């Protein structure tokens, strides 16, 4: 039946499909509704797909932004596998072909009816592409293990998709009564101020009630300076209840217009919440406390059917000097405004991505203006999507600009989509109403790719406990649900795992108060050993990856470590997959894990930016992933140790040799000088990552070394300089490039350069960075709290001359600072 369905949603989005109905709210209805239908219809053209379209939405390509090698393959039923001797130029279709020669020699006798599954992965090898160009194949050339794949033909990835089925008129200004209000605050008098807003910008001066004081009644008219036919569509009516004799007590905002364009009229209670004066970027929906919450009545007043007009009316009424205007394109006056308004049409014409610029011009508190520009973007040409991330952010609220800006990500790639998804998530906080062209976006690209759709529902998933965002997130994720069954039960086992990790968490941290670690941890391994533990904790796919399968949970290599929230150190094996089901996760409950991810993923941008100008800095983008309220899950890098464990042995004479020693019985012979390359390269990324992103406390116990010789950091506490950090350099690290030679001028210099290449191409893409900085502000995050942070990247990034200059001024007090 549909019950145990809307049951298993229920308990997987962690809320109650009847609180929904509950509420009964008709905007959450025809959320409900209308998603539905549409994820129905995604669900639909799914099962029709040919099997190579199902296999790039199920298991889409892990590929990089010649030389001979060994490749084992092997057939679906059978344990039989041949070990060819292929090349890295060669495609994946010569290698099927060799692995159908062979499997026809040996039972005694096309391609084109296979794809290559990576062992014991949800990963796939398909397409027009040479083997060099495929993740899995490139992890194997440097670690220099074997690449152990199986043949599976289109029959049975068939059976797959088969088995996972399912108006100008009123002149008038505009005016509202503040009747009464509660809850608690000091003798002193309380003040409610109330402004009106279209984005960050005031569309008239504010106006503050009358001083009471304290359950206070208030029954006075605030009128404002705009006439009612002069509101825009996206205008918010914010107000801020505070106490004077400031001390700020709680806020509140609403939309005029509601999601079927009406203008509200009647009375409104309104369920604040509790301030840190005005905060327009404020969810415009009450306090769900309703219990506990300081509530404001408030009316608004009638002026009778009044809805906002429709497009064909916008339009219909939207319907040298030359030089001076291109000089102030590459923070302004008055008379420049004015200037960029006049000559709107040749900004449409001549520079059509300075649009960002005209739309901060134009009047909003004017309907005829609102017309004007409106008439332009109903004929603008598609931004490139740099320009488009930029006009999502609360700067541009406007619901034509915001469908726009979507217009101009479609052509996104879902590899790009994958990049700047968990700032597209942030951006749902800023929408004003729950059917919007962004969710549309998310769930329609989330539904055509199997890991946009994992990552979707995570980063909704892990906001559940956040009360301003629950309802919208939880009502996306059912909306997902309904469009993938078979992923929602996929997803269900992940929480399941999830929840007994966390039971399991607390028992340790109570466990190591009252007993040794060796006590301990035996009583983990009892305890993950129960029935239910075994089950649950083993067969699912990473929340980390869903590439990555977790299967047989390897109970003895499973332990905790000694930090403050005593994280989980999990193991898991696979016969299957070999080396490759060989794979460790981190649960970490008790931190928040979101800045780590945001500071990770920074990172990821950063590799990918130098890897696009053929610059391979050797990186670990090793996943961070938070999946609750303070939980979290962090990839197990293997083979890899901190600096302060490789610093004492299990032989140095100094410390600074031991770093170098442990290398050279990783590395020996002929693979040392490869050793010290990884840790040239990987430095000097993690020098310029941390210095851009304002990464300070770094020590031996947060910076890790892997066998190979590169060196990543690890558990980032705060960012863009949070506590103006200068760059970093270490003797020891030092020592290691210049190959424990005292005095070595060609490794260091050529360091030098990777530093300063590494610099200046980040440099170039400095507009990148900041619009995803900006969009993330969205967050909450107490690191990313204002234009101070903004501005923070703004210095570390800085003409190409004058900048380079002064990176090496800076990278000079670095070195010199070095003991
Ligand atoms: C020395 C230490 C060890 N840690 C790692 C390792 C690997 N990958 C990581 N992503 C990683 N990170 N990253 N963020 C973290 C946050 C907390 C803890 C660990 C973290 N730590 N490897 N090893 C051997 N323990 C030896 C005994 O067994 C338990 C592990």
């Given at each position: 039946v549909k019950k145990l369905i809307n049951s298993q949603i229920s308990l997987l989005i962690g809320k109650g499909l009847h609180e929904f109905d509950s509420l009964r709210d008709p905007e959450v209805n025809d959320f409900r509704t209308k998603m539905r239908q549409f994820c129905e219809e995604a669900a639909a053209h799914r099962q029709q797909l040919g099997w190579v379209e199902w296999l790039q939405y199920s298991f889409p390509l892990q590929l990089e932004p010649n030389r001979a090698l060994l490749v084992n393959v092997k057939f679906e039923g059978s344990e039989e596998s041949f070990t060819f001797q292929v090349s890295?130029?060669?495609?994946?279709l010569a290698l099927m072909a060799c692995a159908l020669r062979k499997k026809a020699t040996v039972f005694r006798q096309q391609p084109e009816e296979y794809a290559l599954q990576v062992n014991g992965r949800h990963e796939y090898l398909y397409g027009?592409?040479?083997?060099?160009?495929?993740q899995y194949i490139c992890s194997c050339l440097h670690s220099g293990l074997t690449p152990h794949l199986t043949m599976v033909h289109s029959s049975s990835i068939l059976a797959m998709r088969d088995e996972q089925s399912n108006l100008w008129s009123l002149e008038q200004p505009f005016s509202i009564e503040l009747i009464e209000g509660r809850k608690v605050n000091a003798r002193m008098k309380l003040v409610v101020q109330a402004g009106l807003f279209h984005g960050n910008e005031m569309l008239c001066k504010t106006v503050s009630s009358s001083e009471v004081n304290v359950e206070p009644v208030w029954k006075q008219r605030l009128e404002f300076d705009i006439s009612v036919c002069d509101?825009?569509?996206?205008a918010r009516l914010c107000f801020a209840l505070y106490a004077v004799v400031d001390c700020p007590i709680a806020w509140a905002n609403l939309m005029?217009?509601?999601?079927?364009d009406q203008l509200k009229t009647g009375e409104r209670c309104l369920y604040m919440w509790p301030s840190v004066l005005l905060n327009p970027?404020?969810?415009?929906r009450g306090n769900?406390?309703?219990?506990?919450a300081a509530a404001l009545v408030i009316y608004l007043p009638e002026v009778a059917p009044v809805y906002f007009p429709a497009l064909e009316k916008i339009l219909e009424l939207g319907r040298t000097e030359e030089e001076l205007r291109e000089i102030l394109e590459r923070e302004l006056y008055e008379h420049e405004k004015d200037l960029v308004w006049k000559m709107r049409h040749e900004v449409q014409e001549?520079?059509?991505?300075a649009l960002a610029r005209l739309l901060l011009v134009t009047?909003?508190?004017?309907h005829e203006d609102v017309a004007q520009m409106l008439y332009l973007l109903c004929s603008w040409p598609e931004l490139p999507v740099l320009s488009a991330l930029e006009l999502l952010?609360?700067?541009?609220?406007?619901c034509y600009v915001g469908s726009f800006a979507i217009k101009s990500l479609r052509k996104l790639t879902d590899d790009e989509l994958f990049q700047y998804l968990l700032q597209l998530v942030q951006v749902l906080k800023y929408?004003?109403?729950?059917?919007?062209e962004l969710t549309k976006f998310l769930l329609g690209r989330a539904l055509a790719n199997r890991k946009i759709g994992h990552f979707l529902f995570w980063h909704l998933r892990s906001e559940?406990?956040?009360?301003?965002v629950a309802l919208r997130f939880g009502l996306i994720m059912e909306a997902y649900c309904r469009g993938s069954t078979h992923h929602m039960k996929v997803l269900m086992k992940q929480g399941e795992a999830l929840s007994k990790l966390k039971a399991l968490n607390d028992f340790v941290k109570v466990s190591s108060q009252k007993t040794t670690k060796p006590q301990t941890k035996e009583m983990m391994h009892m305890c993950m050993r129960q029935e239910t533990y075994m089950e649950a904790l083993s067969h699912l796919q990473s929340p980390?990856?869903?590439?990555?399968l977790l299967e047989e949970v390897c109970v003895e290599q499973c332990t905790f470590m000694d930090?403050?929230?005593?994280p989980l150190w999990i193991m898991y094996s696979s016969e299957e997959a070999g080396?490759?089901?060989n794979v460790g996760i981190i649960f970490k409950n008790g931190d928040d894990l979101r800045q780590d991810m945001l500071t990770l993923q920074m990172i990821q941008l950063m590799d990918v930016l130098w890897k696009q100008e053929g610059?391979?800095?050797?990186?670990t983008p090793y996943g961070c992933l938070p999946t609750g309220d303070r939980t979290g899950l962090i990839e197990v890098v293997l083979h890899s140790d901190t600096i302060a464990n490789i610093?004492?042995?299990?032989?140095?004479?100094?410390?600074?040799?031991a770093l170098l020693n442990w290398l050279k019985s990783k590395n020996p012979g002929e693979a040392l000088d490869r050793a010290i390359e990884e840790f040239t390269l990987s430095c000097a990324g993690y020098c310029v990552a941390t210095y851009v992103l304002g990464?300070?406390?770094?020590?031996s116990d947060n910076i890790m070394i892997r066998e190979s010789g590169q060196l990543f950091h690890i558990?980032?506490?705060?960012?863009?300089?949070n506590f103006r950090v200068p760059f970093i350099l270490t003797y020891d690290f030092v020592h290691v490039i210049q190959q424990?030679?005292?005095?070595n001028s060609e490794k260091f210099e050529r360091f030098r350069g990777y530093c300063e290449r590494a610099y200046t191409i980040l440099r170039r893409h400095g507009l990148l960075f900041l619009h995803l900085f900006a969009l993330m502000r969205?967050?909450?995050?107490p690191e990313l709290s204002c234009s101070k942070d903004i501005q923070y990247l703004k210095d570390s990034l800085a003409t190409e001359e004058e900048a380079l200059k002064h990176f090496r001024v800076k990278f000079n007090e670095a070195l010199r600072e070095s003991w």
């Open positions: 890295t130029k060669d495609m994946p027009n592409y040479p083997l060099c160009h495929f509101l825009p569509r996206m005029l217009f509601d999601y079927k970027a404020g969810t415009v769900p406390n309703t219990e506990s001549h520079f059509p991505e009047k909003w508190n004017k952010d609360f700067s541009f609220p406007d929408e004003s109403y729950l059917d919007c559940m406990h956040v009360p301003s980390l990856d869903p590439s990555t930090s403050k929230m005593k080396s490759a089901g610059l391979d800095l050797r990186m610093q004492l042995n299990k032989t140095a004479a100094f410390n600074k040799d990464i300070g406390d770094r020590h558990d980032f506490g705060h960012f863009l300089g424990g030679k005292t005095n969205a967050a909450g995050l």
